[PDB]
């Protein structure tokens, strides 16, 4: 069960929900399997927070061990329309879709804590039909393959080139390891 | 006692009191500052203008 | 599960939960698979927002992997009928439904994310029974098909032949690409 | 979820639910597989509605694909007798019960969308046991085909051999058809 | 979902929901299969209506299908208990329990709806065990149906020996042919 | 779904469930199968009514199958422990644990409705390992079966002979047979 | 369902729950099968009771089939080390860890109903695997028990060695014998 | 099923949740198998109270069978990170994950009951596909189990041979136990 | 599919199952689960060799994990009537129906392998029903376990007491072992 | 199905099954899992080589993964009571029962292909019960570990020590690797 959390303010004291208490400070859980369902909540969450102040950061808690591909590109747009600058924070585990909503974050504020591994791979898909309807599929998930190497060469820094290489197996990166690469900027090891 | 000292009255680690300690009432009132009454419900105002204090 | 947030209001302040907050900002969410509950739950918002004001425009962000046509077709009446114009964003993903729903907002207010799929293909039903059974919803699944693209071209602005040759099987499309066709307006990359 | 809203009245602000929001405004929602449950649930709302001020229309919105005949006419026999009419709007699909329902309205006060559908077709069943059993079983559903036919033919004006004739198998029928067989009399497509 | 309504009253308007606010209007609904636990709540509420008023007359609705015999004799023998007059009002189907439940109200004050369907039958059981038991289980159940046939007898005006001839195997009468027989008193088509 | 209901006293409005309103009343249910979780919710509900008036009579309606030994036994110990009288009412079926709670009753406060049905048997059981282990479970329940019935005459006002040769197989009971028996003192028919 | 009730205060009225408003007058309730999740919720309450008042008893109710032996200990820990007393009272069945959580309450407070039933054994485990791994687990619940025994004949007072045999099998006892073995110190049969 | 509690001040009532009173104190229940939901919701309840107050201690009570890895180190790192020491008890049981975040608190403030368990081993995983995949996961389980010993070994105190050996297999320890190795550093018996 | 061996007759060849060919040799094998349908098989073949020759001896292979109980005594009853000596020898290991027959072998032809366990048990069984019921079947398997203990004691030469105290639980033994405690008379090393 | 090989025998040409053939030819095939249908089906068949000659060497195949522990002591046994000496060969791989059965043959005839590959570990059992015959069936496997090295130490000629460290966990022996570890003499390359 979900903890309550009480409030004061000047008006009085009411109860706030542990998650929702926690968005009043601009932070936002990114927990479990990505789907449509969750994705739509944390764009709610984002916009919501831009409407409040637009120049405040936002803070990203990403522990995922991956999800659905459309239902994450539904939340790197939306990281990349708002004014503000989203912080991510690699906590536990970051895996293909959680790594790339990593590195996704604004340049110098993508941390990750000390015990934390990070794993990046090649899309997973599949089709079950005609001959002509399997080439349709598997030439939609090469290009998304391509055009997700693209972004994320962009955003670590790293050759295209590099990239397809080290995203052709399953490849787990350390949190030292994971700033060579450019996927996250600095680690989190104390507060100040 | 939760600005003074830990802020744990419930649990294994916390303090309760219940070795017949008289004292405890009056050093904590001692530590007695204003925020301690707004807490309490006291407006700002009437703190105001009640500048001396004297515990018991 | 789902955050609650507050509105500051002269008066005071009310809790709300972050879908009904954004409900008040004439904002829709469609997501998940089409279906008659959510579909009419999607018609009492349309209905109560125009209510409210029937002048200002109404958003709705798509994010659905297709579903049930006749419960779709609700929401597309329901968008044509009511005097506001509905802008259409996509966020993710857009199925055959999906799409059909995106191409029906109004004119320069179809808007979708650069990092977003569309797919366009014709109905798919079945029926087992009798001959004569088997040939009436035929009939009736072919009288939709045609009656689908009929409403797509005029939206997209293409012919019907190109039409019904392009959904003859999966056609995945791009943010760029279906500019190009007529699906939508424009694209939103960054704030302003 | 289903979202909250917020009424402004005189006596002040009011949270109420989407559907009960539109309860207030004569509005009725019939959605999903007819059954006991939600048959009495209509029932219900109909007589509160009735008692607040017999002289207002009410409206029933009609998205089901059908459900057993004996909720269904618990339903038929309230829109009757309560003293208002009970106007009725096609949206998306009805069916054999739901089209029951639709053409069962006020006279002039029966609505489709451009783009509904609407199925008509005899009653199903089925019983297993004695032959003895199955005669009495036989009978009676004959006689509700018998009696749901005739009511049929009332309120749309064809004859009562016609309705038999086009009821033995499933005839589909779209809104511009279903204005000339008399199962509604009008079609809503743009607001005035 | 259940509807939320309000009621406006002298000290102020109070929310209620839609089954909370008949029941002030002395309105009891009996829907779905009849069991232990639907019995009670069915007892409750005519034991509390009966302190506020014992000199104004129940309705019970009957919209269910039967269901099991001991459920339904309890609530057989409030109604019997109670001062008030119980008035039933059949809506879509009335089985064994539920016929036995409508006929079983107050003399001059049961109604049947125009296209209602009522069904009367003995009742079913059946044992596994020895033969010593199985006899012992087969008395008794012979005792409930000669107890039943007795009541429906009393209430109904007709002989015992055509109840048994008329309930030995499944019987299906309409709202007018229950007239003639005794289980309801008048057919209710309209307000006046 | 259980409705609510209004209490009207001079010290403010409140909506109070149909269970929650008749246990200040100082009635409580007993309904289905007996278990650990509603028989702790019975004592609880006992042990509170006696604070409030440990000299006015708690009411009891029975209407259950039976349940577990040890479960019943708890309720029999408190009804046993308080002051108050417990007054027993059977309403549907009483059962072997249901009808040991019933004549476990206040002495002359036993009451029956006409048509209710009671049952009367040894305990059931069983057991499944090794030869020396079956003994020890054997013996237990035979200590229980001894229990069982020389409660059961203790209350009945029978011999303890008697009980054991009419509870060696199931034994229905009707309403007026088990007045003859003992398990209750009176039958109520109407309110005079 | 559980029933509200109310009590009746300084600043007027207050709404509980039959559990919650015992456990205002220290009683904790121990009912069905022990787990993490349920242990650590009594642990949670008697910690909370200890700050109120911690010269002040508390009363646990044990009605338990038994449960794992390390969520019991966590609630054994915590009764010895709470400064209050905390009495134990057994109603309908205490198994293994309900005896031993019952012998486990302040010595002249553990109390017992006249018809419960107590039954004490050895612990139950298992473990597939290697042989190795079986010798490392078939050490460590043998500790278990001789810890077990140990603490038993402490409580009880009875010797190490009679508490072995005694708990060799499945052992029951009735109340009165529960004393004479010193599992309880009295039995509660009336009020005063 | 929750009990509910209210505290008692000179503001007023408020009612608050057995979990939710003791999370003012600065109390965090970690039951269960370990996973990212609930490693999620002690994360947050750790940010939340940093934010009250950075200076007072946090009390996490472990009672859990072990579970995922990467859950288990986003707790330890939210540990480490956050300014206010964590104190940590263990209650009746500490399995592989439960004894890392046993040990992981702060030096001097790490408890345990007298009757606890305490298991420690190498971590557990597994992978089915390529034989280059095999190996890469193979890789990197080992690594995670040096990485986890040499914490291990930091906070105990012993060197990363003996933790090794330790580790290999399933080993128990007692509270005695553990504080010889340095898993804790007192055992908590009795209040003061 | 068993290997046939072709040895030559009186015709001149003959091919025979392996178990048919050692059947003349008087030997029988006796094999997986133990019951009815098993047991007859090895009765038969025991009776068809008494027919071929009443004085030589007839070898008999017991590796079964124990079976049915009934079954065994029929084998058993089987042995001491026929004249001829069964010579009992256990191969792998031995169960409680292996036992009980590897002791019921003629003195001096019961063998055993040098590496060869033996497993004692007391008879397993349960019932579930009424009291009555479960005394008639706790009574009949507990002759049982008396007349095994019996026997098996006469062949085995030692005390009844002996065998009550070591047949409580499982006990294991090896080959020389079994020699000592009578089951066998010596094991069987390198032929000749 | 299994093919006809063809032998013009004394009778004439008289087809038989691929492995009757071969067992002619002193050749047992060992295939699958190991269990009590299985290993006395091989009983058999070597018992009757020995009967036709005493003297002659028997070719056995091991191909198996492994199986029941004591179904594979009698074959054990039963190879070394009879006087010809068998060859071990190992087809495709050898696991834990099939190691042990392959250097169980007659030194200087043990031979493996080459590519083979040999695993040992320590058995693997379970049990789940009470703690007393935990420790039992803990104590009988222990000792069975203890048994199976010293008879593979003998064979194989390894030191005990040696062995037990290494039949902790599984060890992957290859071809070469087993001639140098005593398990096999040599490796069949090619015929001759």
Same mark, same amino acid.
Not at chain 2, 11 to 28: P, Q
């Given at each position: 069960?979900?903890?309550?959390?009480?409030?004061?303010?000047?008006?009085?004291?009411?109860?706030?929900?542990?998650?929702?208490?926690?968005?009043?400070?601009?932070?936002?859980?990114?927990?479990?399997?990505?789907?449509?369902?969750?994705?739509?909540?944390?764009?709610?969450?984002?916009?919501?927070?831009?409407?409040?102040?637009?120049?405040?950061?936002?803070?990203?808690?990403?522990?995922?061990?991956?999800?659905?591909?459309?239902?994450?590109?539904?939340?790197?747009?939306?990281?990349?329309?708002?004014?503000?600058?989203?912080?991510?924070?690699?906590?536990?585990?970051?895996?293909?879709?959680?790594?790339?909503?990593?590195?996704?974050?604004?340049?110098?504020?993508?941390?990750?804590?000390?015990?934390?591994?990070?794993?990046?791979?090649?899309?997973?898909?599949?089709?079950?039909?005609?001959?002509?309807?399997?080439?349709?599929?598997?030439?939609?998930?090469?290009?998304?393959?391509?055009?997700?190497?693209?972004?994320?060469?962009?955003?670590?820094?790293?050759?295209?080139?590099?990239?397809?290489?080290?995203?052709?197996?399953?490849?787990?990166?350390?949190?030292?390891?994971?700033?060579?690469?450019?996927?996250?900027?600095?680690?989190?090891?104390?507060?100040? | 006692?939760?600005?003074?000292?830990?802020? *744990?009255?419930?649990?294994?680690? #916390?303090? /309760?009191?219940?070795?017949?300690?008289?004292? *405890?009432?009056?050093?904590?009132? #001692?530590? /007695?500052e204003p925020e301690d009454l707004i807490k309490f419900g006291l407006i700002p105002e009437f703190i105001g203008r009640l500048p001396v204090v004297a515990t018991l």
């Amino acid at each position: 069960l979900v903890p309550m959390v009480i409030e004061q303010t000047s008006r009085g004291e009411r109860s706030f929900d542990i998650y929702s208490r926690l968005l009043k400070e601009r932070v936002i859980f990114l927990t479990g399997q990505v789907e449509d369902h969750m994705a739509n909540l944390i764009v709610a969450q984002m916009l919501f927070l831009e409407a409040e102040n637009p120049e405040k950061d936002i803070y990203l808690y990403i522990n995922s061990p991956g999800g659905v591909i459309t239902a994450g590109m539904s939340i790197y747009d939306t990281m990349q329309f708002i004014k503000p600058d989203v912080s991510t924070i690699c906590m536990g585990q970051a895996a293909s879709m959680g790594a790339f909503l990593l590195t996704a974050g604004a340049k110098g504020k993508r941390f990750c804590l000390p015990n934390s591994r990070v794993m990046i791979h090649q899309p997973l898909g599949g089709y079950q039909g005609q001959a002509t309807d399997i080439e349709i599929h598997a030439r939609e998930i090469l290009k998304v393959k391509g055009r997700m190497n693209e972004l994320m060469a962009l955003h670590t820094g790293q050759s295209l080139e590099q990239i397809e290489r080290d995203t052709e197996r399953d490849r787990f990166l350390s949190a030292p390891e994971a700033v060579e690469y450019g996927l996250v900027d600095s680690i989190l090891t104390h507060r100040n | 006692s939760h600005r003074v000292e830990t802020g *744990s009255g419930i649990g294994f680690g #916390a303090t /309760v009191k219940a070795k017949s300690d008289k004292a *405890s009432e009056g050093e904590l009132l #001692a530590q /007695v500052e204003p925020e301690d009454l707004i807490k309490f419900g006291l407006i700002p105002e009437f703190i105001g203008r009640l500048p001396v204090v004297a515990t018991l």
